[PDB]
RNA sequence: GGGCUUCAACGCCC
RNA sequence: GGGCUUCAACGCCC
């Protein structure tokens, strides 16, 4: 399954961008996070677990395995990361952090052999990296609920779909407003970020006959 | 929205059993859960428990299930089932701890005391219970094992075939690898959910999604 | 140098 | 005793 990148601006893919991601290294370096740095401190700006949670939730999906998914992370401090669909993200937060810390310092994680870059810090904005036919949407409890399967079917045969989800514990849905066409809800109940991710993946897997 | 428990034998509902879960306390003079990060050194020394120490998988799965609409709607209960044969019932309203460190603490305490009690309420949130799982299950309940090597199904379709008074119980192996026979003795069949191997959590979302679709949950 | 791993890097082991 | 928290218990702070 040929790998999706920001260069390919034609192919019809689904893109999820994890926004307000908490990825702030703390000099001692390790990732700043509630557990260890509860005491040191506002806990909300320090929830990298949520990101780590979603990455597993996202890369483990049938849709990524079918390579019609693309993940981006955009932290709460405006750092932008392209995730390579084929990267086998560490399963444990600890190992995750080691890696995440390194990537922030070096700006990219390279495969020990291939020329590919498993993870890369790219320059803003995110609009310069998305496909040219691409619907921009924000997830929000405070919006009209939808069936993900229905929504996906209304897309042009060429139109990709890029959803902005907040990798945060709480807060305003404004984080992507300068980019979005539309904000929508996936549920009557408020969801965790990772759950919102499953919902979309799964609805779109369904829409796209995966698999 | 009435809370579902094993005591109720009639309601139609979806049950997930996280079979083969890796929960084990660790002495050091303090207690923690046996886990591949802290104890990969030790485990190897003693020449075993190679990936028999993946409590995080259970943790992941739990968040994934309880965070799900089908849970919020009260049509889902979960059970755990340990490598070492311990069975846990999980009260559907329990706001499980978000991080693994805080999860560990609580599972270590649950294992030593056999229950976790609400500070104000007298209902338990987690409770160790007696095997077999099949006593605690609804009377009319379809039982299946999720398996990569089993016939693939569309869950929405798989569910609409259930008698209007018949529940569905799914056993997921909460583990990194292994034969999917951790439940051969209870289940009616085994099914696959994808042509790709899944992770336990993903299998779990996939299945919840499916029920949520078919049972009309938003 | 060699290895472990639902965790190329990370995190450990010899 | 009081408090914090997508984490009653847990893990922290006073
Ligand atoms: N009902 C819902 N529908 C679609 N997305 C939702 C949702 N509930 C939460 N989310 C997404 O999941 C993330 C968790 S933050 C949710 C907490 C709170 N309701 C607010 O703030 C949010 O960034 C949001 O994008
Ligand atoms: N393709 C698939 N379809 C349905 N369930 C799957 C699946 N892949 C994995 N699972 C579930 O996820 C769990 C953990 S992964 C299983 C490890 C081992 N390779 C087996 O086989 C399994 O116990 C199984 O129930
Ligand atoms: Mg207290």
Short mmCIF file of C-alpha atoms (C1' of nucleotides) and ligand atoms in Angstrom, two decimals:
data_model
loop_
_atom_site.label_atom_id
_atom_site.label_comp_id
_atom_site.label_asym_id
_atom_site.label_seq_id
_atom_site.Cartn_x
_atom_site.Cartn_y
_atom_site.Cartn_z
CA UNK A 1 0.00 0.00 0.00
CA UNK A 2 1.91 3.07 -1.37
CA UNK A 3 2.49 5.56 1.47
CA UNK A 4 0.59 8.85 1.76
CA UNK A 5 2.55 12.09 2.23
CA UNK A 6 1.97 15.83 2.06
CA UNK A 7 3.56 15.84 -1.43
CA UNK A 8 0.80 13.67 -2.85
CA UNK A 9 -1.84 16.38 -3.22
CA UNK A 10 -4.21 14.44 -5.50
CA UNK A 11 -5.13 11.11 -3.83
CA UNK A 12 -8.38 11.02 -1.84
CA UNK A 13 -7.45 10.42 1.79
CA UNK A 14 -8.73 11.06 5.27
CA UNK A 15 -6.58 13.27 7.44
CA UNK A 16 -6.79 13.69 11.17
CA UNK A 17 -4.90 16.50 12.81
CA UNK A 18 -4.46 16.27 16.57
CA UNK A 19 -4.70 19.89 17.70
CA UNK A 20 -3.64 21.53 20.96
CA UNK A 21 -1.45 18.49 21.47
CA UNK A 22 0.49 18.70 24.73
CA UNK A 23 4.10 18.09 23.66
CA UNK A 24 6.27 20.29 25.79
CA UNK A 25 9.62 18.91 26.88
CA UNK A 26 10.79 19.67 30.40
CA UNK A 27 14.45 20.21 31.25
CA UNK A 28 15.86 17.96 33.99
CA UNK A 29 14.84 16.17 28.92
CA UNK A 30 11.52 14.32 29.16
CA UNK A 31 7.88 15.08 28.18
CA UNK A 32 5.99 17.40 30.49
CA UNK A 33 3.00 15.52 31.82
CA UNK A 34 0.46 15.42 34.66
CA UNK A 35 1.80 12.32 36.48
CA UNK A 36 5.33 13.52 37.17
CA UNK A 37 4.87 17.25 36.91
CA UNK A 38 1.57 17.51 38.73
CA UNK A 39 3.37 19.01 41.70
CA UNK A 40 5.78 21.18 39.72
CA UNK A 41 2.70 23.18 38.60
CA UNK A 42 -2.18 24.12 35.30
CA UNK A 43 -2.55 20.40 34.44
CA UNK A 44 -4.61 20.86 31.26
CA UNK A 45 -1.69 22.08 29.09
CA UNK A 46 0.15 18.85 30.03
CA UNK A 47 -1.83 15.87 28.72
CA UNK A 48 0.47 14.22 26.13
CA UNK A 49 -1.11 10.86 27.02
CA UNK A 50 -4.14 11.98 25.04
CA UNK A 51 -2.00 12.40 21.94
CA UNK A 52 -0.28 9.07 22.56
CA UNK A 53 -3.69 7.49 23.06
CA UNK A 54 -5.01 8.83 19.74
CA UNK A 55 -1.89 7.85 17.79
CA UNK A 56 -2.43 4.24 18.76
CA UNK A 57 -6.16 4.56 18.10
CA UNK A 58 -5.38 6.07 14.68
CA UNK A 59 -2.41 4.11 13.35
CA UNK A 60 -3.95 0.83 14.47
CA UNK A 61 -7.01 1.48 12.36
CA UNK A 62 -8.00 -0.64 9.33
CA UNK A 63 -8.07 2.63 7.34
CA UNK A 64 -4.40 3.36 8.00
CA UNK A 65 -3.56 -0.26 7.22
CA UNK A 66 -5.37 0.36 3.93
CA UNK A 67 -3.31 3.53 3.72
CA UNK A 68 -6.10 6.04 3.15
CA UNK A 69 -5.34 7.81 6.44
CA UNK A 70 -2.89 10.56 7.36
CA UNK A 71 -2.12 11.93 10.80
CA UNK A 72 -0.83 15.38 11.69
CA UNK A 73 -0.18 16.77 15.14
CA UNK A 74 -0.33 20.49 15.91
CA UNK A 75 0.63 21.29 19.50
CA UNK A 76 -0.71 23.97 21.83
CA UNK A 77 2.41 26.01 21.02
CA UNK A 78 2.00 25.79 17.27
CA UNK A 79 4.60 23.16 16.44
CA UNK A 80 3.55 21.03 13.44
CA UNK A 81 4.31 17.33 12.93
CA UNK A 82 3.63 15.03 10.00
CA UNK A 83 3.25 11.41 11.03
CA UNK A 84 4.23 8.70 8.57
CA UNK A 85 1.32 6.22 8.14
CA UNK A 86 3.67 3.21 8.38
CA UNK A 87 5.36 4.18 11.67
CA UNK A 88 4.76 1.63 14.45
CA UNK A 89 4.43 4.14 17.29
CA UNK A 90 5.74 2.93 20.67
CA UNK A 91 3.00 1.16 22.62
CA UNK A 92 3.96 2.54 26.04
CA UNK A 93 3.78 6.16 27.02
CA UNK A 94 7.27 5.97 28.52
CA UNK A 95 8.86 4.79 25.27
CA UNK A 96 6.58 7.20 23.46
CA UNK A 97 8.07 10.09 25.46
CA UNK A 98 11.68 9.12 24.89
CA UNK A 99 10.91 9.23 21.20
CA UNK A 100 8.70 12.31 21.31
CA UNK A 101 11.39 14.25 23.22
CA UNK A 102 14.09 13.27 20.73
CA UNK A 103 11.91 14.29 17.74
CA UNK A 104 11.33 17.77 19.15
CA UNK A 105 15.09 18.27 19.63
CA UNK A 106 16.10 16.81 16.25
CA UNK A 107 13.02 17.88 14.18
CA UNK A 108 12.58 14.43 12.63
CA UNK A 109 12.82 10.72 13.41
CA UNK A 110 14.65 8.76 10.75
CA UNK A 111 14.35 5.04 10.08
CA UNK A 112 17.62 3.31 11.00
CA UNK A 113 17.87 2.28 7.31
CA UNK A 114 15.30 3.77 4.91
CA UNK A 115 15.49 7.36 3.66
CA UNK A 116 11.89 7.86 4.81
CA UNK A 117 11.19 9.99 7.88
CA UNK A 118 8.96 8.22 10.38
CA UNK A 119 8.08 11.57 11.99
CA UNK A 120 8.83 15.13 10.92
CA UNK A 121 8.36 18.69 12.15
CA UNK A 122 6.99 20.67 9.19
CA UNK A 123 6.38 24.42 8.83
CA UNK A 124 2.98 26.10 9.22
CA UNK A 125 0.40 26.39 8.16
CA UNK A 126 -1.19 22.99 7.78
CA UNK A 127 -3.01 24.26 4.69
CA UNK A 128 0.19 24.16 2.62
CA UNK A 129 0.44 20.40 3.15
CA UNK A 130 -3.12 19.18 2.65
CA UNK A 131 -4.54 17.97 -0.72
CA UNK A 132 -5.97 20.63 -3.03
CA UNK A 133 -9.47 19.16 -2.99
CA UNK A 134 -9.97 18.79 0.78
CA UNK A 135 -12.91 19.50 3.12
CA UNK A 136 -11.80 21.08 6.39
CA UNK A 137 -13.90 20.21 9.43
CA UNK A 138 -13.68 20.64 13.21
CA UNK A 139 -15.11 18.22 15.74
CA UNK A 140 -17.15 19.83 18.50
CA UNK A 141 -19.63 18.80 21.16
CA UNK A 142 -21.18 22.21 20.51
CA UNK A 143 -22.30 21.44 16.95
CA UNK A 144 -24.88 19.58 14.81
CA UNK A 145 -24.47 15.81 15.26
CA UNK A 146 -23.91 13.72 12.11
CA UNK A 147 -23.61 10.18 10.81
CA UNK A 148 -20.00 9.87 9.71
CA UNK A 149 -20.95 7.33 7.05
CA UNK A 150 -23.53 9.69 5.47
CA UNK A 151 -21.18 12.70 5.56
CA UNK A 152 -18.29 10.82 3.84
CA UNK A 153 -20.56 9.68 0.96
CA UNK A 154 -21.37 13.28 -0.01
CA UNK A 155 -17.74 13.95 -0.90
CA UNK A 156 -16.56 14.48 -4.46
CA UNK A 157 -14.79 11.44 -5.90
CA UNK A 158 -11.62 13.53 -5.56
CA UNK A 159 -12.36 15.44 -2.34
CA UNK A 160 -10.30 14.39 0.69
CA UNK A 161 -11.51 14.92 4.22
CA UNK A 162 -9.49 16.51 7.03
CA UNK A 163 -10.82 16.63 10.59
CA UNK A 164 -9.41 18.71 13.43
CA UNK A 165 -9.73 17.05 16.82
CA UNK A 166 -8.56 18.47 20.13
CA UNK A 167 -6.01 16.26 21.95
CA UNK A 168 -6.93 18.04 25.17
CA UNK A 169 -9.01 17.35 28.27
CA UNK A 170 -11.19 20.46 28.10
CA UNK A 171 -11.74 23.66 26.15
CA UNK A 172 -12.87 25.83 23.25
CA UNK A 173 -13.35 24.30 19.80
CA UNK A 174 -11.82 27.42 18.28
CA UNK A 175 -8.33 25.89 17.74
CA UNK A 176 -8.82 25.42 13.98
CA UNK A 177 -11.43 28.12 13.19
CA UNK A 178 -9.15 30.02 10.78
CA UNK A 179 -8.99 26.88 8.61
CA UNK A 180 -12.32 25.05 9.02
CA UNK A 181 -15.31 25.12 6.63
CA UNK A 182 -17.62 23.66 9.27
CA UNK A 183 -17.80 22.33 12.86
CA UNK A 184 -19.82 19.21 13.63
CA UNK A 185 -20.55 16.69 16.37
CA UNK A 186 -20.31 12.93 16.22
CA UNK A 187 -22.35 12.21 19.31
CA UNK A 188 -25.05 13.29 21.73
CA UNK A 189 -22.59 12.49 24.51
CA UNK A 190 -19.30 14.29 25.00
CA UNK A 191 -16.47 12.05 23.83
CA UNK A 192 -12.80 11.58 24.65
CA UNK A 193 -10.46 12.63 21.86
CA UNK A 194 -9.52 9.04 21.02
CA UNK A 195 -13.14 7.90 20.93
CA UNK A 196 -13.98 10.74 18.56
CA UNK A 197 -11.15 9.34 16.40
CA UNK A 198 -12.51 5.78 16.36
CA UNK A 199 -15.95 7.14 15.40
CA UNK A 200 -14.59 8.87 12.36
CA UNK A 201 -12.19 6.15 11.28
CA UNK A 202 -14.91 3.56 11.61
CA UNK A 203 -17.67 5.56 9.92
CA UNK A 204 -15.29 6.27 7.00
CA UNK A 205 -14.04 2.70 6.85
CA UNK A 206 -17.71 1.81 6.42
CA UNK A 207 -18.21 4.55 3.83
CA UNK A 208 -15.13 3.42 1.93
CA UNK A 209 -15.82 -0.30 2.00
CA UNK A 210 -12.88 -1.17 4.28
CA UNK A 211 -12.31 -4.09 4.94
CA UNK B 1 -30.46 5.43 32.90
CA UNK B 2 -30.31 2.23 35.04
CA UNK B 3 -26.83 0.83 35.66
CA UNK B 4 -26.31 -2.65 34.22
CA UNK B 5 -24.91 -5.50 36.33
CA UNK B 6 -24.69 -9.28 36.37
CA UNK B 7 -27.61 -9.34 38.83
CA UNK B 8 -29.83 -8.31 35.88
CA UNK B 9 -30.27 -11.38 33.68
CA UNK B 10 -32.84 -10.10 31.14
CA UNK B 11 -31.97 -6.78 29.51
CA UNK B 12 -30.53 -6.96 26.00
CA UNK B 13 -27.03 -5.52 26.03
CA UNK B 14 -23.50 -5.84 24.77
CA UNK B 15 -20.88 -7.39 27.01
CA UNK B 16 -17.15 -7.28 26.42
CA UNK B 17 -14.86 -9.61 28.29
CA UNK B 18 -11.21 -8.66 28.21
CA UNK B 19 -9.87 -12.19 28.47
CA UNK B 20 -6.30 -13.10 29.28
CA UNK B 21 -5.61 -9.72 30.86
CA UNK B 22 -2.16 -9.13 32.35
CA UNK B 23 -2.77 -8.00 35.92
CA UNK B 24 -0.29 -9.01 38.62
CA UNK B 25 0.99 -7.11 41.65
CA UNK B 26 4.72 -6.63 42.28
CA UNK B 27 6.41 -6.49 45.67
CA UNK B 28 9.80 -4.74 45.43
CA UNK B 29 8.43 -2.87 50.24
CA UNK B 30 5.62 -1.41 48.08
CA UNK B 31 3.21 -2.70 45.45
CA UNK B 32 2.78 -2.00 41.74
CA UNK B 33 1.51 -3.84 38.66
CA UNK B 34 3.79 -6.22 36.79
CA UNK B 35 4.51 -4.35 33.56
CA UNK B 36 6.88 -4.54 30.61
CA UNK B 37 8.47 -1.08 31.21
CA UNK B 38 9.61 -1.32 34.81
CA UNK B 39 10.13 -5.07 34.83
CA UNK B 40 11.47 -6.15 31.44
CA UNK B 41 14.80 -6.51 33.24
CA UNK B 42 13.42 -8.83 35.92
CA UNK B 43 11.06 -10.79 33.61
CA UNK B 44 13.93 -11.74 31.30
CA UNK B 45 16.17 -12.70 34.24
CA UNK B 46 13.57 -15.21 35.33
CA UNK B 47 13.30 -16.40 31.76
CA UNK B 48 9.63 -15.94 31.07
CA UNK B 49 6.59 -13.69 31.33
CA UNK B 50 7.71 -12.47 27.89
CA UNK B 51 4.83 -10.03 27.16
CA UNK B 52 2.81 -11.67 29.92
CA UNK B 53 3.12 -8.20 31.38
CA UNK B 54 0.92 -5.92 29.25
CA UNK B 55 -1.57 -4.44 31.70
CA UNK B 56 -1.59 -1.32 29.51
CA UNK B 57 -3.59 -3.19 26.92
CA UNK B 58 -6.32 -3.77 29.50
CA UNK B 59 -6.04 -0.10 30.48
CA UNK B 60 -6.34 0.99 26.87
CA UNK B 61 -9.28 -1.28 26.26
CA UNK B 62 -11.13 -0.02 29.32
CA UNK B 63 -10.88 3.63 28.41
CA UNK B 64 -11.95 2.76 24.88
CA UNK B 65 -15.04 0.85 26.07
CA UNK B 66 -16.27 3.09 28.88
CA UNK B 67 -15.63 6.22 26.88
CA UNK B 68 -17.90 4.78 24.19
CA UNK B 69 -21.47 6.03 23.53
CA UNK B 70 -22.80 2.51 23.91
CA UNK B 71 -21.47 2.72 27.44
CA UNK B 72 -22.81 6.25 27.99
CA UNK B 73 -26.18 4.93 26.77
CA UNK B 74 -25.99 2.15 29.36
CA UNK B 75 -26.13 -0.76 26.92
CA UNK B 76 -22.71 -2.15 27.70
CA UNK B 77 -20.97 -3.89 30.53
CA UNK B 78 -17.39 -5.08 30.73
CA UNK B 79 -15.66 -7.90 32.53
CA UNK B 80 -12.01 -8.71 33.02
CA UNK B 81 -10.41 -12.10 33.08
CA UNK B 82 -6.86 -12.37 34.15
CA UNK B 83 -4.03 -14.54 32.88
CA UNK B 84 -3.98 -15.88 36.42
CA UNK B 85 -7.74 -16.58 36.31
CA UNK B 86 -9.11 -13.62 38.29
CA UNK B 87 -12.52 -12.34 37.13
CA UNK B 88 -13.59 -8.71 37.51
CA UNK B 89 -16.92 -6.96 36.99
CA UNK B 90 -16.69 -3.31 36.04
CA UNK B 91 -19.45 -0.96 37.07
CA UNK B 92 -20.34 0.96 33.86
CA UNK B 93 -20.38 4.34 35.60
CA UNK B 94 -16.81 4.09 36.84
CA UNK B 95 -14.64 6.94 35.58
CA UNK B 96 -11.53 4.80 35.26
CA UNK B 97 -8.23 6.68 35.86
CA UNK B 98 -6.89 8.33 32.68
CA UNK B 99 -3.22 7.48 33.14
CA UNK B 100 -1.52 4.14 33.53
CA UNK B 101 0.30 5.17 36.72
CA UNK B 102 -2.99 5.97 38.39
CA UNK B 103 -4.62 2.94 36.82
CA UNK B 104 -1.93 0.67 38.30
CA UNK B 105 -2.36 2.04 41.81
CA UNK B 106 -6.07 1.28 41.68
CA UNK B 107 -5.75 -2.19 40.14
CA UNK B 108 -3.17 -3.09 42.78
CA UNK B 109 -5.67 -2.00 45.44
CA UNK B 110 -8.56 -3.79 43.74
CA UNK B 111 -6.59 -7.01 43.63
CA UNK B 112 -5.64 -6.89 47.31
CA UNK B 113 -9.14 -5.95 48.58
CA UNK B 114 -11.27 -7.70 45.92
CA UNK B 115 -13.46 -4.59 45.46
CA UNK B 116 -13.36 -0.80 44.97
CA UNK B 117 -16.10 1.12 46.76
CA UNK B 118 -17.49 4.57 46.06
CA UNK B 119 -16.68 6.91 48.95
CA UNK B 120 -20.36 7.84 49.34
CA UNK B 121 -22.20 4.94 47.67
CA UNK B 122 -22.37 1.27 48.70
CA UNK B 123 -22.36 -0.16 45.19
CA UNK B 124 -18.88 -1.27 44.10
CA UNK B 125 -17.15 0.20 41.04
CA UNK B 126 -15.01 -2.83 40.42
CA UNK B 127 -15.57 -6.20 42.04
CA UNK B 128 -13.69 -9.48 41.94
CA UNK B 129 -16.27 -12.21 41.38
CA UNK B 130 -16.37 -16.00 41.09
CA UNK B 131 -15.91 -18.00 37.88
CA UNK B 132 -17.25 -18.98 35.63
CA UNK B 133 -18.24 -15.81 33.78
CA UNK B 134 -21.16 -17.86 32.44
CA UNK B 135 -23.04 -17.67 35.76
CA UNK B 136 -23.06 -13.90 35.77
CA UNK B 137 -24.10 -13.55 32.14
CA UNK B 138 -27.65 -12.86 30.92
CA UNK B 139 -29.77 -15.96 30.35
CA UNK B 140 -30.24 -15.44 26.61
CA UNK B 141 -26.81 -14.28 25.47
CA UNK B 142 -24.90 -14.98 22.25
CA UNK B 143 -21.24 -15.65 22.92
CA UNK B 144 -18.39 -15.17 20.46
CA UNK B 145 -14.61 -14.96 20.32
CA UNK B 146 -12.90 -12.28 18.25
CA UNK B 147 -10.18 -13.85 16.16
CA UNK B 148 -8.10 -12.87 13.17
CA UNK B 149 -8.37 -16.41 11.70
CA UNK B 150 -12.14 -16.59 11.96
CA UNK B 151 -14.72 -15.69 9.31
CA UNK B 152 -14.88 -11.92 8.91
CA UNK B 153 -18.17 -10.21 9.74
CA UNK B 154 -19.89 -6.83 9.50
CA UNK B 155 -20.88 -6.21 13.12
CA UNK B 156 -23.97 -4.15 12.28
CA UNK B 157 -25.32 -7.10 10.32
CA UNK B 158 -24.08 -9.59 12.92
CA UNK B 159 -26.13 -7.76 15.52
CA UNK B 160 -29.46 -7.18 13.74
CA UNK B 161 -29.87 -10.98 13.67
CA UNK B 162 -30.11 -11.18 17.49
CA UNK B 163 -33.43 -12.08 19.05
CA UNK B 164 -35.05 -8.96 20.49
CA UNK B 165 -34.44 -10.43 23.95
CA UNK B 166 -30.95 -11.80 23.34
CA UNK B 167 -27.70 -10.20 24.45
CA UNK B 168 -24.24 -10.38 22.89
CA UNK B 169 -21.03 -11.29 24.70
CA UNK B 170 -17.66 -10.75 23.03
CA UNK B 171 -14.37 -12.13 24.35
CA UNK B 172 -11.28 -10.14 23.37
CA UNK B 173 -7.75 -11.31 24.17
CA UNK B 174 -6.31 -8.34 26.05
CA UNK B 175 -2.81 -9.26 25.00
CA UNK B 176 0.01 -8.79 22.49
CA UNK B 177 -0.10 -12.31 20.97
CA UNK B 178 -1.47 -15.83 21.56
CA UNK B 179 -3.91 -18.48 20.37
CA UNK B 180 -7.48 -17.12 20.39
CA UNK B 181 -8.82 -20.05 22.40
CA UNK B 182 -8.89 -18.32 25.77
CA UNK B 183 -12.65 -18.94 25.71
CA UNK B 184 -13.26 -21.96 23.42
CA UNK B 185 -15.17 -23.61 26.26
CA UNK B 186 -17.87 -20.91 26.44
CA UNK B 187 -18.36 -19.45 22.94
CA UNK B 188 -20.77 -20.38 20.11
CA UNK B 189 -18.31 -19.35 17.38
CA UNK B 190 -15.35 -17.09 16.58
CA UNK B 191 -15.44 -14.11 14.24
CA UNK B 192 -12.95 -11.77 12.58
CA UNK B 193 -13.67 -8.04 12.26
CA UNK B 194 -11.05 -7.04 9.68
CA UNK B 195 -8.70 -8.57 7.11
CA UNK B 196 -6.00 -6.80 9.06
CA UNK B 197 -4.81 -7.91 12.48
CA UNK B 198 -6.27 -5.52 15.04
CA UNK B 199 -5.26 -4.39 18.51
CA UNK B 200 -7.61 -5.25 21.38
CA UNK B 201 -8.69 -1.63 21.79
CA UNK B 202 -9.42 -1.30 18.07
CA UNK B 203 -11.38 -4.54 17.99
CA UNK B 204 -13.31 -2.94 20.87
CA UNK B 205 -14.08 0.34 19.18
CA UNK B 206 -14.97 -1.49 16.01
CA UNK B 207 -17.45 -3.62 17.91
CA UNK B 208 -18.96 -0.76 19.91
CA UNK B 209 -19.26 1.36 16.80
CA UNK B 210 -21.11 -1.50 15.18
CA UNK B 211 -23.56 -2.01 18.03
CA UNK B 212 -23.97 1.76 18.29
CA UNK B 213 -24.97 1.87 14.63
CA UNK B 214 -27.34 -1.04 14.82
CA UNK B 215 -28.92 -0.14 18.14
CA UNK B 216 -29.31 3.45 17.09
CA UNK B 217 -26.83 5.19 19.36
CA UNK B 218 -25.42 8.66 18.68
"C1'" G C 1 29.38 -5.71 18.67
"C1'" G C 2 25.08 -8.80 19.69
"C1'" G C 3 20.13 -9.12 21.35
"C1'" C C 4 14.56 -8.10 23.37
"C1'" U C 5 9.85 -6.05 21.86
"C1'" U C 6 1.45 -5.56 19.80
"C1'" C C 7 7.67 -0.12 21.26
"C1'" A C 8 13.10 0.94 13.55
"C1'" A C 9 13.90 5.52 16.70
"C1'" C C 10 12.40 4.98 22.16
"C1'" G C 11 13.21 2.02 26.30
"C1'" C C 12 15.79 -1.89 28.18
"C1'" C C 13 19.32 -6.43 28.07
"C1'" C C 14 24.35 -9.02 27.30
"C1'" G D 1 -8.43 17.76 58.05
"C1'" G D 2 -8.73 20.57 53.52
"C1'" G D 3 -7.62 20.63 48.13
"C1'" C D 4 -6.30 19.15 42.80
"C1'" U D 5 -7.84 16.20 38.51
"C1'" U D 6 -10.90 14.07 30.57
"C1'" C D 7 -7.93 10.05 37.23
"C1'" A D 8 -14.53 8.73 43.76
"C1'" A D 9 -10.82 4.91 44.68
"C1'" C D 10 -5.69 6.00 42.40
"C1'" G D 11 -1.83 9.63 42.08
"C1'" C D 12 -0.59 14.13 43.80
"C1'" C D 13 -0.70 19.36 46.58
"C1'" C D 14 -1.53 22.15 51.33
N1 LIG E 1 -19.94 14.79 21.13
C1 LIG E 1 -18.83 15.00 20.42
N2 LIG E 1 -18.90 14.97 19.04
C2 LIG E 1 -17.75 15.18 18.29
N3 LIG E 1 -16.54 15.42 18.91
C3 LIG E 1 -16.46 15.44 20.26
C4 LIG E 1 -17.60 15.23 21.04
N4 LIG E 1 -17.24 15.32 22.34
C5 LIG E 1 -15.92 15.57 22.40
N5 LIG E 1 -15.41 15.65 21.12
C6 LIG E 1 -13.98 15.92 20.76
O1 LIG E 1 -13.12 15.26 21.68
C7 LIG E 1 -12.24 16.17 22.33
C8 LIG E 1 -12.34 16.02 23.85
S1 LIG E 1 -12.41 17.59 24.76
C9 LIG E 1 -14.12 17.24 25.29
C10 LIG E 1 -14.50 17.80 26.66
C11 LIG E 1 -15.53 18.94 26.65
N6 LIG E 1 -16.86 18.45 26.29
C12 LIG E 1 -15.08 20.06 25.72
O2 LIG E 1 -14.03 20.68 25.92
C13 LIG E 1 -12.62 17.58 21.88
O3 LIG E 1 -11.48 18.26 21.41
C14 LIG E 1 -13.64 17.40 20.77
O4 LIG E 1 -13.08 17.78 19.53
N1 LIG E 2 -8.44 -9.12 12.57
C1 LIG E 2 -9.11 -9.25 13.72
N2 LIG E 2 -10.48 -9.39 13.72
C2 LIG E 2 -11.16 -9.52 14.92
N3 LIG E 2 -10.48 -9.50 16.12
C3 LIG E 2 -9.13 -9.36 16.13
C4 LIG E 2 -8.42 -9.23 14.93
N4 LIG E 2 -7.11 -9.10 15.23
C5 LIG E 2 -6.98 -9.15 16.58
N5 LIG E 2 -8.21 -9.30 17.15
C6 LIG E 2 -8.50 -9.40 18.60
O1 LIG E 2 -7.55 -8.63 19.33
C7 LIG E 2 -6.95 -9.45 20.34
C8 LIG E 2 -5.48 -9.11 20.64
S1 LIG E 2 -4.24 -9.14 19.31
C9 LIG E 2 -4.18 -10.96 19.34
C10 LIG E 2 -2.78 -11.54 19.39
C11 LIG E 2 -2.59 -12.79 18.55
N6 LIG E 2 -1.85 -12.48 17.33
C12 LIG E 2 -3.97 -13.42 18.28
O2 LIG E 2 -4.21 -14.10 17.28
C13 LIG E 2 -7.20 -10.91 19.96
O3 LIG E 2 -7.39 -11.75 21.09
C14 LIG E 2 -8.43 -10.85 19.07
O4 LIG E 2 -9.59 -11.17 19.81
MG1 LIG E 3 -9.02 12.90 48.88
#
